[PDB]
Structure formats: structure tokens, C-alpha cells
Design a binder for this molecule. Structure first.
Ligand SMILES: OC[C@H]1O[C@H](O[C@H]2[C@H](O)[C@@H](O)[C@@H](O[C@H]3[C@H](O)[C@@H](O)[C@@H](O[C@H]4[C@H](O)[C@@H](O)[C@@H](O)O[C@@H]4CO)O[C@@H]3CO)O[C@@H]2CO)[C@H](O)[C@@H](O)[C@@H]1O
Length: 457
């Protein structure tokens, strides 16, 4: 589509898209510009595919962790808020949408997972993960269960995996080390082992997912769930009297959720960038605009200071921010999707008994490190001129060890297939050393010097 004089917006289907459509109708009334809100499945995987063809929505909403990869691939317009508009939003929310020094999206709202609990079944929720088996043994006798939440998406199990030490990529000196992946350390093993023990002891079912847990909680069948602010609307409509509180500790350490900033990026290919700017700054990021969305599904702690001051008086929002401060803002680097895919497979395989915890997590660390390295090496090879990539292949065609890389394999391979061949054949660490040295040899000392700086700590 991408037609001029219309805005198309994509937002995930668990968000308040009917409220956002109401903000779109006000824009249309005031300006004559139609706004279409859609919620495609897997919108966050479809956006990079269609935007790289010059198509897609004008505006895309997702948590900020996806946006670095979109920006690195050139799919997002840099946004240009004036100083006066920037002062309307909290400074840490602007940081979450900064990539390579540029603002690449409008931050909307700060999301963190909380422990949600049914006050009639459980007037005093647990402070610890460790007491949840004893607490479930009690509720079973009453015909209930202690805790159901989505085990299919690692976003929901990460708080526990990280509590005693798990991490995605090691952070220091303001930069993330994509070679130092923390999904296989002692603390991650301990958290996932606890989760799987909960399943093997029949306190949880490995196949619980979002809709199952949400239904069970909102029907009064389970005393607790783990969810974000978007889920409160549906509990409000049910008969459940709930509270929202800090996640349980594990081995005495806070559960550490990955905090998302819901963010609106502008497609690089859109011919409507100025209208999208006007819609986001003057209609959405206002008291009325955010109230319209929030009434549909709550946003969490919004980035807009004037509205957030009213929301911050809600103890549910107090709890959301308490959990946020116990966790960490997600990285936005392009390698975050590699981390998430690897962890997702590990948690599903351990929970279903397909693999042990130790083997699931050992494979997740290898998979994440390999995919992260592929991402970086691809990006660098894409910076070679086509004539320099040809010289590169001749250099690597002579690289020894069991067998070499045959000429026909490289002959018509582009930068991504070349990155894959090198990594498949040499492993991530050697693939990168060979490519770095080859950049020096074919006289791209700019790539050589910048690549050297990647691994310095
Ligand atoms: O094939 C496996 C699955 O692939 C797809 O899911 C991927 C995503 O494409 C990745 O982006 C990532 O997802 C992260 C996500 O980026 C991160 O923001 C967080 O998502 C929260 C969201 O912030 C929050 O607002 C609310 O919507 O809940 C989301 C979690 O459900 O965490 C996600 C990780 O859990 O990783 C997954 C792979 O796990 C695809 O969409 C799936 O349909 C597919 O099965």
C-alpha cells in the first residue's frame, strides 16, 4: 500500500488498537487524512520483510528492542522532534529509542511484568518463588492452582532466569559484548531448573500459553498470573478483584524483567513522514491521545510526563515501575532477536522434557552467539563494494581448516550467504578474524578499524 495522503499503522493485537483507531478518527476529522490501524500477526517479523521492499505501514509500534535491527537495516526514518517536544517525555524513554546516536522512534510507554493476584483467593501473595509449590499444594486441595502464566514466550520466563545471574549480552563501558552471552551461567541454570521442577512436580503445565493463563486467571481458577499492564482491562471486566505487585524473589534476589518501551517508528519508505510526525507528536503523545489508548488497554507508565503524573498515583503503576527498576531496559541492538529466538527454544525444550536444562541452555548460548556473530559479519560484508567482495572471496578461498570452501560455493554468494558459509565452516570466532584481516588486505582499513573496535572492552 504506502499510499500518499493516508496513514497505515501497525500495532500488536494485545495492545489498545481500538483506542488508537479513535485517535486516528480525530486526526481524520481535523485534517481529512484517513488513518488505518491494523494488527497483523507476527507484525514484527513482517515489517522488516515488507519495508525492505519499500512497502509496509507508515508507522510501526513495538517494544524498543526490535528497533535497532530495523534501524541498522535502514528501515526507519530518523525522527526530528524539536527541543520543546523532547522535554515533554522522560529522558530515559528517549534513550531507549536512540541507536547509533540518532532518535529512531517516538517512545510511548514503559512496560514491565508484575505479579498479578486474585485478592479473594490469596489476600497475601508470596514474596518468593520457593514457596509457590507449597502454596499450590494448598490451592489444589481447594480445587484451584497457584500460578499460571505464558510459558511459550521467553519474555515471561526471563525474570526468573535472570534473578540469580542470567543475562543476555554482557554490558560494560556503555556497550554490549555480543560474544559474552549469559544464558548458560550458574544463575540461569538455577532459574530454569526451578521452572522445570515446578512443571515436573505438577504445579504448572508446560503447554500453558497466553490465552490459557489469561482465561484461567480471569475466571477465578488460578490465584496468580504474570502479565503486563495491557492485561488489566480484561481483568477489570471480569469478576476478579485483583492486585498488582512485585514479582517473587528467587534465592533472595529480585526477579529481573526485561523492560520494554512501546515505541512508534516511521517507515523509511513512507511518503507520509510529516503527517506521521504530526499524528504522533500532536495527537497521540497528548493527554487525550494517550488516555484514549489507555482506556482500551492500559499502556503502563507513559513516556508523556503530564499524563504519567496522573497515572503514577495508581498502585498498579507503582508496582509496574517497581518491577521495572528491579529489571533492566532491553538492549536495542540488532542481535536482540538472536537472543530471544535462542532462549525461546531453550525454555520450550526444557519445559517439555525434550532436553535437559543444561543441554537446552548450552545449545541456546551457542545458537545465540552464532546468530549474533552472523548478524555482525553480514553487516560488515554488506559494506563491501561488489568488486571488493570478489577480492575477498579469492582471499578466503585459500583459507585452510576439514575441507576448504569450494569456489562454486562462493562464486555467486551475496554478503549474507558468504557470512553464513564462513561461520558454518570456521565457527564465529575464526570467521570474524579472517574477515577482519581480509578487510586490511583489500584496503578497507575503515572497516578493519571499526571492526577492531567492536571487540575491545
Ligand atoms: O518463531 C517463534 C516466534 O517468532 C516471533 O517471535 C519472536 C519475536 O519476533 C522477537 O521480536 C522476540 O520477541 C520478543 C519481543 O521483541 C520483546 O519486545 C518482548 O515482547 C513482549 C512485548 O514487549 C510486550 O509488549 C507484550 O506484547 O508481550 C511480548 C511477549 O509476548 O519479548 C518477546 C520475546 O518473548 O522473540 C520472539 C521469539 O520468542 C513470532 O512473533 C512468534 O509468533 C513466533 O512463534
Amino acid at each position: 500500500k504506502i499510499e500518499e495522503g493516508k496513514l497505515v499503522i501497525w500495532i500488536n493485537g494485545d495492545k489498545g488498537y481500538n483506542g488508537l483507531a479513535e485517535v486516528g478518527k480525530k486526526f481524520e476529522k481535523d485534517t481529512g487524512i484517513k488513518v488505518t490501524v491494523e494488527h497483523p500477526d507476527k507484525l514484527e517479523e513482517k515489517f522488516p520483510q515488507v519495508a525492505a521492499t519499500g512497502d509496509g505501514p507508515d508507522i510501526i509500534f513495538w517494544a524498543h528492542d526490535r528497533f535497532g535491527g530495523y534501524a541498522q537495516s535502514g528501515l526507519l526514518a530518523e525522527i526530528t522532534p524539536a527541543a520543546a517536544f523532547q522535554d515533554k517525555l522522560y529522558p530515559f524513554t528517549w534513550d531507549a529509542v536512540r541507536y547509533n546516536g540518532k532518535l529512531i522512534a517516538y517512545p510511548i510507554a514503559v512496560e514491565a511484568l508484575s505479579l498479578i493476584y486474585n485478592k479473594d483467593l490469596l489476600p497475601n501473595p508470596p514474596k518468593t518463588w520457593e514457596e509457590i509449590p507449597a502454596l499450590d499444594k494448598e490451592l489444589k486441595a481447594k480445587g484451584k492452582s497457584a500460578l499460571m502464566f505464558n510459558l511459550q514466550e521467553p519474555y515471561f520466563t526471563w525474570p526468573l532466569i535472570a534473578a540469580d545471574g542470567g543475562y543476555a549480552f554482557k554490558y560494560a563501558a556503555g556497550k554490549y559484548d555480543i560474544k559474552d552471552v549469559g544464558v548458560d551461567n550458574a544463575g540461569a541454570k538455577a532459574g530454569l531448573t526451578f521452572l522445570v521442577d515446578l512443571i515436573k512436580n505438577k504445579h504448572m503445565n508446560a503447554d500453558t500459553d497466553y490465552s490459557i493463563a489469561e482465561a484461567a486467571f480471569n475466571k477465578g481458577e488460578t490465584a496468580m498470573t504474570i502479565n503486563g499492564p495491557w492485561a488489566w482491562s480484561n481483568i477489570d471486566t471480569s469478576a476478579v478483584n485483583y492486585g498488582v505487585t512485585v514479582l517473587p524473589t528467587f534465592k533472595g534476589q529480585p526477579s529481573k524483567p526485561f523492560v520494554g518501551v512501546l515505541s512508534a517508528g516511521i517507515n523509511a519508505a513512507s511518503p507520509n513522514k510529516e503527517l506521521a510526525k504530526e499524528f504522533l507528536e500532536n495527537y497521540l503523545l497528548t493527554d487525550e491521545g494517550l488516555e484514549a489508548v489507555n482506556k482500551d488497554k492500559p499502556l503502563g507508565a507513559v513516556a508523556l510526563k503530564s499524563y504519567e503524573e496522573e497515572l503514577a498515583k495508581d498502585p498498579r503503576i507503582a508496582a509496574t515501575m517497581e518491577n521495572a527498576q528491579k529489571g533492566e531496559i532491553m538492549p536495542n541492538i540488532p542481535q536482540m532477536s538472536a537472543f530471544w529466538y535462542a532462549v525461546r527454544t531453550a525454555v520450550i525444550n526444557a519445559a517439555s522434557g525434550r532436553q535437559t536444562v543444561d543441554a537446552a541452555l548450552a545449545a541456546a548460548q551457542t545458537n545465540a552467539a552464532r546468530a549474533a556473530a552472523l548478524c555482525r559479519l553480514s553487516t560488515y560484508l554488506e559494506e563491501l563494494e561488489a568488486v571488493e567482495l570478489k577480492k575477498f572471496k579469492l582471499y578466503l578461498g585459500t583459507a585452510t581448516e576439514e575441507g576448504k570452501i569450494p569456489w562454486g560455493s562462493m562464486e555467486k554468494a551475496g554478503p549474507l550467504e558468504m557470512a553464513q558459509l564462513l561461520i558454518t565452516h570456521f565457527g564465529p570466532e575464526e570467521a570474524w578474524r579472517l574477515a577482519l584481516s581480509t578487510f586490511e588486505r583489500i584496503n578497507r582499513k575503515d572497516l578493519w578499524e571499526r571492526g577492531q573496535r567492536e571487540d575491545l572492552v
